[PDB]
Design a protein around this ligand. Structure first.
Ligand SMILES: *[C@H]1C[C@@H](CC(C)C)C[C@H]2CN[C@H](C(=O)N[C@H]3[C@H]4O[C@H](SCC/C=C\[C@H]3C)[C@H](O)[C@@H](O)[C@H]4O)[C@@H]2O1
Ligand SMILES: [K+]
Ligand SMILES: [Mg+2]
Ligand SMILES: [Mg+2]
Ligand SMILES: [Mg+2]
Ligand SMILES: [Mg+2]
Ligand SMILES: [Mg+2]
Ligand SMILES: [Mg+2]
Ligand SMILES: [Mg+2]
Ligand SMILES: [Mg+2]
Ligand SMILES: [Mg+2]
Ligand SMILES: [Mg+2]
Ligand SMILES: [Mg+2]
Ligand SMILES: [Mg+2]
Ligand SMILES: [Mg+2]
Ligand SMILES: [Mg+2]
Ligand SMILES: [Mg+2]
Ligand SMILES: [Mg+2]
Ligand SMILES: [Mg+2]
Ligand SMILES: [Mg+2]
Ligand SMILES: [Mg+2]
Ligand SMILES: [Mg+2]
Ligand SMILES: [Mg+2]
Ligand SMILES: [Mg+2]
Ligand SMILES: [Mg+2]
Ligand SMILES: [Mg+2]
Ligand SMILES: [Mg+2]
Ligand SMILES: [Mg+2]
Ligand SMILES: [Mg+2]
Ligand SMILES: [Mg+2]
Ligand SMILES: [Mg+2]
Ligand SMILES: [Mg+2]
Ligand SMILES: [Mg+2]
Ligand SMILES: [Mg+2]
Ligand SMILES: [Mg+2]
Ligand SMILES: [Mg+2]
Ligand SMILES: [Mg+2]
Ligand SMILES: [Mg+2]
Ligand SMILES: [Mg+2]
Ligand SMILES: [Mg+2]
Ligand SMILES: [Mg+2]
Ligand SMILES: [Mg+2]
Ligand SMILES: [Mg+2]
Ligand SMILES: [Mg+2]
Ligand SMILES: [Mg+2]
Ligand SMILES: [Mg+2]
Ligand SMILES: [Mg+2]
Ligand SMILES: [Mg+2]
Ligand SMILES: [Mg+2]
Ligand SMILES: [Mg+2]
Ligand SMILES: [Mg+2]
Ligand SMILES: [Mg+2]
Ligand SMILES: [Mg+2]
Ligand SMILES: [Mg+2]
Ligand SMILES: [Mg+2]
Ligand SMILES: [Mg+2]
Ligand SMILES: [Mg+2]
Ligand SMILES: [Mg+2]
Ligand SMILES: [Mg+2]
Ligand SMILES: [Mg+2]
Ligand SMILES: [Mg+2]
Ligand SMILES: [Mg+2]
Ligand SMILES: [Mg+2]
Ligand SMILES: [Mg+2]
Ligand SMILES: [Mg+2]
Ligand SMILES: [Mg+2]
Ligand SMILES: [Mg+2]
Ligand SMILES: [Mg+2]
Ligand SMILES: [Mg+2]
Ligand SMILES: [Mg+2]
Ligand SMILES: [Mg+2]
Ligand SMILES: [Mg+2]
Ligand SMILES: [Mg+2]
Ligand SMILES: [Mg+2]
Ligand SMILES: [Mg+2]
Ligand SMILES: [Mg+2]
Ligand SMILES: [Mg+2]
Ligand SMILES: [Mg+2]
Ligand SMILES: [Mg+2]
Ligand SMILES: [Mg+2]
Ligand SMILES: [Mg+2]
Ligand SMILES: [Mg+2]
Ligand SMILES: [Mg+2]
Ligand SMILES: [Mg+2]
Ligand SMILES: [Mg+2]
Ligand SMILES: [Mg+2]
Ligand SMILES: [Mg+2]
Ligand SMILES: [Mg+2]
Ligand SMILES: [Mg+2]
Ligand SMILES: [Mg+2]
Ligand SMILES: [Mg+2]
Ligand SMILES: [Mg+2]
Ligand SMILES: [Mg+2]
Ligand SMILES: [Mg+2]
Ligand SMILES: [Mg+2]
Ligand SMILES: [Mg+2]
Ligand SMILES: [Mg+2]
Ligand SMILES: [Mg+2]
Ligand SMILES: [Mg+2]
Ligand SMILES: [Mg+2]
Ligand SMILES: [Mg+2]
Ligand SMILES: [Mg+2]
Ligand SMILES: [Mg+2]
Ligand SMILES: [Mg+2]
Ligand SMILES: [Mg+2]
Ligand SMILES: [Mg+2]
Ligand SMILES: [Mg+2]
Ligand SMILES: [Mg+2]
Ligand SMILES: [Mg+2]
Ligand SMILES: [Mg+2]
Ligand SMILES: [Mg+2]
Ligand SMILES: [Mg+2]
Ligand SMILES: [Mg+2]
Ligand SMILES: [Mg+2]
Ligand SMILES: [Mg+2]
Ligand SMILES: [Mg+2]
Ligand SMILES: [Mg+2]
Ligand SMILES: [Mg+2]
Ligand SMILES: [Mg+2]
Ligand SMILES: [Mg+2]
Ligand SMILES: [Mg+2]
Ligand SMILES: [Mg+2]
Ligand SMILES: [Mg+2]
Ligand SMILES: [Mg+2]
Ligand SMILES: [Mg+2]
Ligand SMILES: [Mg+2]
Ligand SMILES: [Mg+2]
Ligand SMILES: [Mg+2]
Ligand SMILES: [Mg+2]
Ligand SMILES: [Mg+2]
Ligand SMILES: [Mg+2]
Ligand SMILES: [Mg+2]
Ligand SMILES: [Mg+2]
Ligand SMILES: [Mg+2]
Ligand SMILES: [Mg+2]
Ligand SMILES: [Mg+2]
Ligand SMILES: [Mg+2]
Ligand SMILES: [Mg+2]
Ligand SMILES: [Mg+2]
Ligand SMILES: [Mg+2]
Ligand SMILES: [Mg+2]
Ligand SMILES: [Mg+2]
Ligand SMILES: [Mg+2]
Ligand SMILES: [Mg+2]
Ligand SMILES: [Mg+2]
Ligand SMILES: [Mg+2]
Ligand SMILES: [Mg+2]
Ligand SMILES: [Mg+2]
Ligand SMILES: [Mg+2]
Ligand SMILES: [Mg+2]
Ligand SMILES: [Mg+2]
Ligand SMILES: [Mg+2]
Ligand SMILES: [Mg+2]
Ligand SMILES: [Mg+2]
Ligand SMILES: [Mg+2]
Ligand SMILES: [Mg+2]
Ligand SMILES: [Mg+2]
Ligand SMILES: [Mg+2]
Ligand SMILES: [Mg+2]
Ligand SMILES: [Mg+2]
Ligand SMILES: [Mg+2]
Ligand SMILES: [Mg+2]
Ligand SMILES: [Mg+2]
Ligand SMILES: [Mg+2]
Ligand SMILES: [Mg+2]
Ligand SMILES: [Mg+2]
Ligand SMILES: [Mg+2]
Ligand SMILES: [Mg+2]
Ligand SMILES: [Mg+2]
Ligand SMILES: [Mg+2]
Ligand SMILES: [Mg+2]
Ligand SMILES: [Mg+2]
Ligand SMILES: [Mg+2]
Ligand SMILES: [Mg+2]
Ligand SMILES: [Mg+2]
Ligand SMILES: [Mg+2]
Ligand SMILES: [Mg+2]
Ligand SMILES: [Mg+2]
Ligand SMILES: [Mg+2]
Ligand SMILES: [Mg+2]
Ligand SMILES: [Mg+2]
Ligand SMILES: [Mg+2]
Ligand SMILES: [Mg+2]
Ligand SMILES: [Mg+2]
Ligand SMILES: [Mg+2]
Ligand SMILES: [Mg+2]
Ligand SMILES: [Mg+2]
Ligand SMILES: [Mg+2]
Ligand SMILES: [Mg+2]
Ligand SMILES: [Mg+2]
Ligand SMILES: [Mg+2]
Ligand SMILES: [Mg+2]
Ligand SMILES: [Mg+2]
Ligand SMILES: [Mg+2]
Ligand SMILES: [Mg+2]
Ligand SMILES: [Mg+2]
Ligand SMILES: [Mg+2]
Ligand SMILES: [Mg+2]
Ligand SMILES: [Mg+2]
Ligand SMILES: [Mg+2]
Ligand SMILES: [Mg+2]
Ligand SMILES: [Mg+2]
Ligand SMILES: [Mg+2]
Ligand SMILES: [Mg+2]
Ligand SMILES: [Mg+2]
Ligand SMILES: [Mg+2]
Ligand SMILES: [Mg+2]
Ligand SMILES: [Mg+2]
Ligand SMILES: [Mg+2]
Ligand SMILES: [Mg+2]
Ligand SMILES: [Mg+2]
Ligand SMILES: [Mg+2]
Ligand SMILES: [Mg+2]
Ligand SMILES: [Mg+2]
Ligand SMILES: [Mg+2]
Ligand SMILES: [Mg+2]
Ligand SMILES: [Mg+2]
Ligand SMILES: [Mg+2]
Ligand SMILES: [Mg+2]
Ligand SMILES: [Mg+2]
Ligand SMILES: [Mg+2]
Ligand SMILES: [Mg+2]
Ligand SMILES: [Mg+2]
Ligand SMILES: [Mg+2]
Ligand SMILES: [Mg+2]
Ligand SMILES: [Mg+2]
Ligand SMILES: [Mg+2]
Ligand SMILES: [Mg+2]
Ligand SMILES: [Mg+2]
Ligand SMILES: [Mg+2]
Ligand SMILES: [Mg+2]
Ligand SMILES: [Mg+2]
Ligand SMILES: [Mg+2]
Ligand SMILES: [Mg+2]
Ligand SMILES: [Mg+2]
Ligand SMILES: [Mg+2]
Ligand SMILES: [Mg+2]
Ligand SMILES: [Mg+2]
Ligand SMILES: [Mg+2]
Ligand SMILES: [Mg+2]
Ligand SMILES: [Mg+2]
Ligand SMILES: [Mg+2]
Ligand SMILES: [Mg+2]
Ligand SMILES: [Mg+2]
Ligand SMILES: [Mg+2]
Ligand SMILES: [Mg+2]
Ligand SMILES: [Mg+2]
Ligand SMILES: [Mg+2]
Ligand SMILES: [Mg+2]
Ligand SMILES: [Mg+2]
Ligand SMILES: [Mg+2]
Ligand SMILES: [Mg+2]
Ligand SMILES: [Mg+2]
Ligand SMILES: [Mg+2]
Ligand SMILES: [Mg+2]
Lengths: 48, 275
RNA sequence: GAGCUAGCCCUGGCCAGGGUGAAGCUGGGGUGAGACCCAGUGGAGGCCCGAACCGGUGGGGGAUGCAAACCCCUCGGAUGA
RNA sequence: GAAUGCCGGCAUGAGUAACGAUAAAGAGGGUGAGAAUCCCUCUCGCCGUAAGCCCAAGGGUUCCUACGCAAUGGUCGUCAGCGUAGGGUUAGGCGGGACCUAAGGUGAAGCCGAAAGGCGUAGCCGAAGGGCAGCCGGUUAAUAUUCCGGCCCUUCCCGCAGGUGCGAUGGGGGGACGCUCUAGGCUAGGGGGACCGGAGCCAUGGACGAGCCCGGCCAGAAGCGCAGGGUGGGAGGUAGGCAAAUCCGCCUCCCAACAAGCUCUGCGUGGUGGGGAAGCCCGGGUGACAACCCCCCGAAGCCAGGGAGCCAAGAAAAGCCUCUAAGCACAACCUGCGGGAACCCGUACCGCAAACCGACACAGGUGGGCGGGUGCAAGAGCACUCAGGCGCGCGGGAGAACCCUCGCCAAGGAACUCUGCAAGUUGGCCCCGUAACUUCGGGAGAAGGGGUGCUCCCUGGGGUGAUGAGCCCCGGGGAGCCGCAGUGAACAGGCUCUGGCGACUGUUUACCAAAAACACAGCUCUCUGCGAACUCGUAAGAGGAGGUAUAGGGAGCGACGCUUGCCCGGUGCCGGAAGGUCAAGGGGAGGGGUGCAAGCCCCGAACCGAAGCCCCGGUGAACGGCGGCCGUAACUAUAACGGUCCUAAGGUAGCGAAAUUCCUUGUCGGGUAAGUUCCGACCUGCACGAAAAGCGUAACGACCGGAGCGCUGUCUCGGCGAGGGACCCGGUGAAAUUGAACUGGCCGUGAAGAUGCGGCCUACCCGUGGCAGGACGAAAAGACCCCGUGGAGCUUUACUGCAGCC
RNA sequence: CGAUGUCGGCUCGUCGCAUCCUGGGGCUGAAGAAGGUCCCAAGGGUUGGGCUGUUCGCCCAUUAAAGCGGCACGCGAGCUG
RNA sequence: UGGGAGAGGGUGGUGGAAUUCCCGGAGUAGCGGUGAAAUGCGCAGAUACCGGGAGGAACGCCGAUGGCGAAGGCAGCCACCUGGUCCACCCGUGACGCUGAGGCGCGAAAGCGUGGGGAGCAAACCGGAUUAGAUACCCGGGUAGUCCACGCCCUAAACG
RNA sequence: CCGAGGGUAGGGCCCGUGACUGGGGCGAAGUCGUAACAAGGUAGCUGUACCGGAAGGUGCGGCUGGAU
């Protein structure tokens, strides 16, 4: 049947992407915590 | 003269539609339309603030002239009468001798080809706009400003009118469409006559799809819901109200008055509505 | 977190074929004039049969499955909310 | 040593289940260490509105080639979407950007919020919408509207020529629009040809033929032809289009007005450029100087912004055209021509799937376009087939039980069962015919029946063409022929009577309930005069609504018909300028502390003093409620009638053993051989009853009762047969579970149901196929029940607060 | 209570005997036939249907008879629901 | 042809009296009602009086034993549209007449549908009296309805 | 071919019968009230409407077949 993951590059970048994270107090904290933890990627990668 | 249908479907049994006999022009004046931004009852928060709205036919908003004191003394000819889906009244297309074109809501009996005009000296003829002070006591009028130069507010729905009961200083006394007795300032403009399309009240929508066409989504009784939803919600089996009948938000909905207490316009209300 | 689901907003798209035959229109009859009747034309409808499409009624299978809801037969809607 | 402990390792079940759609395989020849599994060939089968082809998303090198087979591949592997390497994606015209706006987002101005932030006109962003210039063929192992070939086109810059008041983010026009139905003419596509071109073929009885088989085109600029769309011309006035305006709008006059003209597309033709089959021979070559022609069918596509009808009344902005403003009129703009200029990103491959979403090469899910032929009334349905693509990544045998999917069945025919559950029956089209009731539509496909193939003869109308022929769509009449049977295969209603519920089409518990539930038109009550009520928000701001009482919110009821009675004492709501109570506050009789005192400080009565409450009214489609006992008639029985207690008032009409009736299978009647169900009645209604509506109601229903006809493997009562499994052999090889085990019956015993204790009985050791009585078998720290001064949802006249409102 | 699945049916039985029938008896208010009552006897047998979920029960038509009870109200790792 | 009388009919308009309610004023202890009473209303200021407003319905006098219409029925006043009828003249047609099964149309009141309207009145209904009872007669409330538009109903002591 | 008739299916009219139900006629001395006849103690009747154990009452309009 129709499962729950229906990938969509525009959706992905507009929802979890770098710019959406920056435009918000909580998104900036997300970037801050993932940097402090040393994540290799701070946001999902999408081809664009 | 609302039109009936033979019962060739269960819904065509009772469905009645307006007769459209007074309409003479079937597409609107491109100069005077703009797009009507549908809300679905959602406010700028995105939240439903008026339930059960949405999904009706597409509409273009026809700009209507509710000022009319815009063009005192300039006569206009009534060129067309048209269907307007944003209001119950029909609208008349005016060609002013200026060349300027405008929509008014179409009073009763208004004839295509006659002329109308606005101002302190206009004739007392159906379709003319005078300050309230200059319209004789007894005249049945529509499209009435509530405060001067603020725009026609009262008596705009199909069939409605206000009647001029008397004068008192700078104010006239109107019997509003609801039976209320109110003082409206005499410099307020009003239009001579009652609104047209008075058969509008006798339309029988006839089926449920009709309500959907008009943007009306189905309305759920609070007694069909659960406690988390409604004061009438819950119960094993059917259930009477079991408390004073109440809104989804808990206030009483059989009798409880809700006009603000100390509202300044109270000074200007002679008699609250009737019936 | 509404890329699942629910509702709404914007903009696009889709609905084989067959059936039934509303109003109106025309003509004919009718009458003081009418109502109205008949024929033809017409092609209405949360109209009918039925694919796609959308469903999920009954039964059977499946039950460490092909599948964390599937399969087969049957069945509902299919110009409309 | 135990924590259903944690991490890891390794056992057991077990060579067990399984190896993923039952579309299907066999053989020969190659290759190689090794082949059912890779390559080739022949035979067979499967899809063919796809299981074929082309886009979009998503994926991200999976594409092509060489060399590989440890692992991955449910077997094998020499093969592969796998390993290693190398190669491969070419654009002014395709898509996106340097263009436009949509919701929405963002946001100079501005507004609001302890902070973070929230709003917000313009403007900006935002597309699968608008706008904008490329078609055909060839080439590569792999890209091509991109390279190449042929023929077309767009914009930008500079120039020459001719023309013009040139000039805009400003004005206007236009862009610019719905649903259903639809005309003319075309194209796409398809069918036939006794015509044209072609390698061939004559079999097995016949045919050397008007034979079989194959093919008979595609693109094209100007010009022209056919079919359409768009569009009035001139003049005068002018105060409107937030400056101006010759434009636009408004008024007048004149002419043109089925037209025309101009303009713009579609189709055809068109210089020219391509393509070009079977067959045969080795993707190639030939065929071939290939031929490329006539007739017919014909779109849902094109002309298009076409036409008609309808109500629910159907985006914007730019490009473009026109107007003028600053300005400039040595400029500028328009037309024509010439030369130059033309950037960034995508382009491989998969794409109904082994490459996307489902942990898997997973029977599931995934938007758009093409989707051929024949027959079946039609069609995208169904059967078979073209092109093209496949046989589903374990096989080989056997021919048990049992299971699944399927076929048939003597006599009977629902006797099965909770239930005809299931499976039969019926089944398309044409014709005949068709009941109660009805809201006159319907009920209706009611029911029930007849017809249906093939051949010969005759003949009617519609399309094409010419009016004929020919092709083509519907037929009508007659005479025959064959079979068990003519919708001969495939796809395709079983019917009726009667009741309950709900008017109806719709909606719902994704994944145990589709319903009588929700919704629904319709009815009533109630609130709301607009900065409305109401809703979301601390606010600003929004929605309501660019609406205005024929409107909008809330609530119940639920088409329609006939109706909806009595109670206002309690609760709610509504009205009440009196009275009673009432907070801060006002007032300050009169006290108190301290100081020598002026004073300073504190308590403080009467009295004035809102809402709310009390109190007086009203109000039921507001919350709700609508009696008891006793007696009585000239047979009996029963009480129209009476008496009395009580209430705010004592349940009216209609209905009633009911979706409600406990006693209950009430009693009677019907249906049956027999009826706890059903239907019709009765009424002592445990415990109906009138908008939590009451009683009916045509039509409707995958709802729930009851009956009958038809027909049956449901059954008496089972039999046989098919295939996929099960079974045996080769390959690969799980699982939950498991204290250890050398694990029998009975009668007892035991924590009360013993393989394990006692006594007796029985029993050589180990398996394989089967069945399920036991191992209080597995699974799940019982969901029932209680317990915990555990938790959570929900209620209210429980307590206490809070928002909101007064 | 770290789970002993709970009514009825179906299927398959097996056991007790306080015997429904069939066999053997004594007494009888046993003339015969038929019946009553008790004794012995568990070998075998003990039907088909209507109603209801029913067990049970009532009813129809039969019968030699239409027995009662145990087996976790026998039997859901056997089915049904 | 020339005239006449008439509440004949339809539409529109429009005038004053009266009642009810509302507001202002003034004023106080009752008003109302009956056979008598009581319910009811009134110091929250009623009744009675003055002024202002709103709204609906019916038209006093004239008015009659009157007039008109086929009947049902028709009454302030005004305009318009329209029917019937009578008289005079003796001018025109030349029996063109009478009746009339069916048919069609009209048809008080009440009642029904859909809108509106609602002052007075008033079935139902509530209350107060009366009475043995009093589902009545009397009194206080009161909803349909009575009024308008359209559409039905088609009855009557529709009687002379 | 037609054809008595038989079968199947569905209609129409009539007769008989039916749990129960509706009123109707009738019947020496039943129960409740007293509606009508006198102004019958509320003049009566009337069509309609609603209500009521019952006769009846009441609304609206009509009649005199009403009285003084
Ligand atoms: C039902 C009977 C109750 C008594 C009734 C309610 C009066 C008594 C319990 C006693 N134990 C049984 C039990 O609990 N059984 C459960 C079973 O669950 C499934 S079987 C399907 C569900 C039926 C019953 C459960 C409640 C398991 O597979 C079984 O092993 C057993 O756990 C009685 O139950
Ligand atoms: K329980
Ligand atoms: Mg889904
Ligand atoms: Mg999605
Ligand atoms: Mg999707
Ligand atoms: Mg995307
Ligand atoms: Mg996208
Ligand atoms: Mg997206
Ligand atoms: Mg976001
Ligand atoms: Mg982002
Ligand atoms: Mg911050
Ligand atoms: Mg910060
Ligand atoms: Mg990571
Ligand atoms: Mg790094
Ligand atoms: Mg992130
Ligand atoms: Mg209708
Ligand atoms: Mg009709
Ligand atoms: Mg109109
Ligand atoms: Mg515009
Ligand atoms: Mg809005
Ligand atoms: Mg916004
Ligand atoms: Mg709301
Ligand atoms: Mg809404
Ligand atoms: Mg409106
Ligand atoms: Mg309108
Ligand atoms: Mg004012
Ligand atoms: Mg209405
Ligand atoms: Mg609408
Ligand atoms: Mg509604
Ligand atoms: Mg509802
Ligand atoms: Mg509920
Ligand atoms: Mg509920
Ligand atoms: Mg919630
Ligand atoms: Mg709560
Ligand atoms: Mg609540
Ligand atoms: Mg409740
Ligand atoms: Mg409930
Ligand atoms: Mg209940
Ligand atoms: Mg409920
Ligand atoms: Mg209650
Ligand atoms: Mg409440
Ligand atoms: Mg008011
Ligand atoms: Mg979503
Ligand atoms: Mg469709
Ligand atoms: Mg048909
Ligand atoms: Mg027409
Ligand atoms: Mg339909
Ligand atoms: Mg059909
Ligand atoms: Mg079935
Ligand atoms: Mg299984
Ligand atoms: Mg499952
Ligand atoms: Mg399936
Ligand atoms: Mg199927
Ligand atoms: Mg079906
Ligand atoms: Mg269809
Ligand atoms: Mg259908
Ligand atoms: Mg639609
Ligand atoms: Mg230990
Ligand atoms: Mg464990
Ligand atoms: Mg542990
Ligand atoms: Mg351990
Ligand atoms: Mg562990
Ligand atoms: Mg390790
Ligand atoms: Mg291991
Ligand atoms: Mg071991
Ligand atoms: Mg092993
Ligand atoms: Mg083995
Ligand atoms: Mg085993
Ligand atoms: Mg297995
Ligand atoms: Mg498997
Ligand atoms: Mg299959
Ligand atoms: Mg199969
Ligand atoms: Mg082979
Ligand atoms: Mg091999
Ligand atoms: Mg090998
Ligand atoms: Mg193979
Ligand atoms: Mg091969
Ligand atoms: Mg095909
Ligand atoms: Mg991937
Ligand atoms: Mg390998
Ligand atoms: Mg290696
Ligand atoms: Mg492997
Ligand atoms: Mg696999
Ligand atoms: Mg090799
Ligand atoms: Mg490549
Ligand atoms: Mg190019
Ligand atoms: Mg540039
Ligand atoms: Mg901010
Ligand atoms: Mg954006
Ligand atoms: Mg953009
Ligand atoms: Mg675009
Ligand atoms: Mg382009
Ligand atoms: Mg081109
Ligand atoms: Mg090369
Ligand atoms: Mg337009
Ligand atoms: Mg438009
Ligand atoms: Mg558009
Ligand atoms: Mg429409
Ligand atoms: Mg072409
Ligand atoms: Mg064809
Ligand atoms: Mg031969
Ligand atoms: Mg012109
Ligand atoms: Mg001008
Ligand atoms: Mg070739
Ligand atoms: Mg050659
Ligand atoms: Mg199409
Ligand atoms: Mg078009
Ligand atoms: Mg058009
Ligand atoms: Mg815009
Ligand atoms: Mg200048
Ligand atoms: Mg110059
Ligand atoms: Mg020019
Ligand atoms: Mg650039
Ligand atoms: Mg490419
Ligand atoms: Mg592909
Ligand atoms: Mg699929
Ligand atoms: Mg597809
Ligand atoms: Mg693939
Ligand atoms: Mg596979
Ligand atoms: Mg798959
Ligand atoms: Mg073909
Ligand atoms: Mg067919
Ligand atoms: Mg296979
Ligand atoms: Mg397959
Ligand atoms: Mg074997
Ligand atoms: Mg067969
Ligand atoms: Mg048989
Ligand atoms: Mg039978
Ligand atoms: Mg039979
Ligand atoms: Mg049966
Ligand atoms: Mg059942
Ligand atoms: Mg069939
Ligand atoms: Mg019948
Ligand atoms: Mg019939
Ligand atoms: Mg019937
Ligand atoms: Mg019926
Ligand atoms: Mg009918
Ligand atoms: Mg038939
Ligand atoms: Mg025949
Ligand atoms: Mg044949
Ligand atoms: Mg069918
Ligand atoms: Mg029943
Ligand atoms: Mg329903
Ligand atoms: Mg329902
Ligand atoms: Mg109902
Ligand atoms: Mg109904
Ligand atoms: Mg309904
Ligand atoms: Mg439907
Ligand atoms: Mg469910
Ligand atoms: Mg669920
Ligand atoms: Mg769920
Ligand atoms: Mg679930
Ligand atoms: Mg289910
Ligand atoms: Mg349910
Ligand atoms: Mg359903
Ligand atoms: Mg529901
Ligand atoms: Mg309904
Ligand atoms: Mg209703
Ligand atoms: Mg209403
Ligand atoms: Mg704050
Ligand atoms: Mg707005
Ligand atoms: Mg509303
Ligand atoms: Mg409902
Ligand atoms: Mg009826
Ligand atoms: Mg009360
Ligand atoms: Mg009260
Ligand atoms: Mg009360
Ligand atoms: Mg107070
Ligand atoms: Mg209560
Ligand atoms: Mg109460
Ligand atoms: Mg009643
Ligand atoms: Mg009963
Ligand atoms: Mg009942
Ligand atoms: Mg009950
Ligand atoms: Mg009972
Ligand atoms: Mg019972
Ligand atoms: Mg019984
Ligand atoms: Mg019987
Ligand atoms: Mg019954
Ligand atoms: Mg009884
Ligand atoms: Mg209720
Ligand atoms: Mg109830
Ligand atoms: Mg009923
Ligand atoms: Mg019915
Ligand atoms: Mg249904
Ligand atoms: Mg249903
Ligand atoms: Mg069988
Ligand atoms: Mg077999
Ligand atoms: Mg062997
Ligand atoms: Mg092996
Ligand atoms: Mg392996
Ligand atoms: Mg051991
Ligand atoms: Mg051992
Ligand atoms: Mg052992
Ligand atoms: Mg043993
Ligand atoms: Mg014991
Ligand atoms: Mg033992
Ligand atoms: Mg032992
Ligand atoms: Mg032991
Ligand atoms: Mg031992
Ligand atoms: Mg021992
Ligand atoms: Mg022992
Ligand atoms: Mg022992
Ligand atoms: Mg033994
Ligand atoms: Mg074995
Ligand atoms: Mg075994
Ligand atoms: Mg076992
Ligand atoms: Mg077992
Ligand atoms: Mg066991
Ligand atoms: Mg245990
Ligand atoms: Mg066990
Ligand atoms: Mg479990
Ligand atoms: Mg635990
Ligand atoms: Mg526990
Ligand atoms: Mg548990
Ligand atoms: Mg639970
Ligand atoms: Mg317990
Ligand atoms: Mg406690
Ligand atoms: Mg405790
Ligand atoms: Mg607790
Ligand atoms: Mg709690
Ligand atoms: Mg707080
Ligand atoms: Mg409030
Ligand atoms: Mg337990
Ligand atoms: Mg355990
Ligand atoms: Mg367990
Ligand atoms: Mg059985
Ligand atoms: Mg025996
Ligand atoms: Mg039984
Ligand atoms: Mg039992
Ligand atoms: Mg029983
Ligand atoms: Mg015997
Ligand atoms: Mg027993
Ligand atoms: Mg027991
Ligand atoms: Mg027991
Ligand atoms: Mg059992
Ligand atoms: Mg079970
Ligand atoms: Mg059981
Ligand atoms: Mg078990
Ligand atoms: Mg067991
Ligand atoms: Mg059950
Ligand atoms: Mg007083
Ligand atoms: Mg006083
Ligand atoms: Mg009034
Ligand atoms: Mg003469
Ligand atoms: Mg009448
Ligand atoms: Mg009284
Ligand atoms: Mg007395
Ligand atoms: Mg008379
Ligand atoms: Mg015979
Ligand atoms: Mg009397
Ligand atoms: Mg008397
Ligand atoms: Mg008397
Ligand atoms: Mg009297
Ligand atoms: Mg009375």
């Amino acid at each position: 049947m129709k499962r729950t993951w229906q990938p969509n590059r525009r959706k992905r970048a507009k929802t979890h992407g770098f710019r959406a994270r920056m435009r918000t107090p909580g998104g900036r904290k997300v970037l801050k915590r993932r940097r402090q933890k040393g994540r290799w990627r701070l946001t999902p990668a999408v081809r664009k | 003269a609302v039109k009936k249908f033979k019962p060739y479907t269960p819904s065509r049994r009772f469905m009645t539609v307006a007769d459209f006999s007074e309409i003479t022009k079937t597409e609107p004046e491109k100069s005077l339309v703009k797009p009507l931004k549908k809300t679905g009852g959602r406010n700028n928060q995105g939240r439903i603030t008026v339930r059960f709205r949405g999904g009706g036919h597409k509409r273009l908003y026809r700009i209507i002239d509710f000022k009319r004191w815009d063009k005192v003394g300039i006569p206009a000819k009534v060129a067309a009468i048209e269907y307007d889906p944003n209001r119950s009244a029909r609208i008349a297309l005016l060609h002013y001798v200026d060349g300027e074109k405008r929509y008014i809501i179409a009073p009763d009996g208004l004839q295509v080809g006659q002329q109308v005009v606005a101002g302190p000296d206009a004739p007392i003829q159906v379709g003319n706009a005078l300050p309230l002070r200059f319209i004789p006591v007894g005249t049945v009028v529509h499209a009435v400003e509530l405060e001067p130069k603020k725009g026609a507010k009262l008596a705009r729905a199909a069939g409605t009118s206000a009647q001029i009961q008397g004068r008192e200083g700078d104010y006239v006394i109107l019997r509003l469409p609801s039976g209320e007795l109110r003082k409206v300032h005499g410099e307020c403009y009003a239009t001579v006559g009652a609104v047209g399309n008075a058969d509008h009240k006798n339309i029988v929508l006839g089926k449920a799809g009709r309500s959907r066409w008009l943007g009306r989504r189905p309305h759920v009784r609070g007694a069909a819901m659960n406690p988390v939803d409604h004061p009438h919600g819950g119960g094993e089996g059917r259930a009477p109200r079991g408390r004073p009948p109440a809104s989804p938000w808990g206030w009483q909905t059989k009798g409880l008055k809700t006009r603000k207490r100390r509202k300044p316009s109270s000074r200007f209300i002679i008699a609250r509505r009737k019936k």
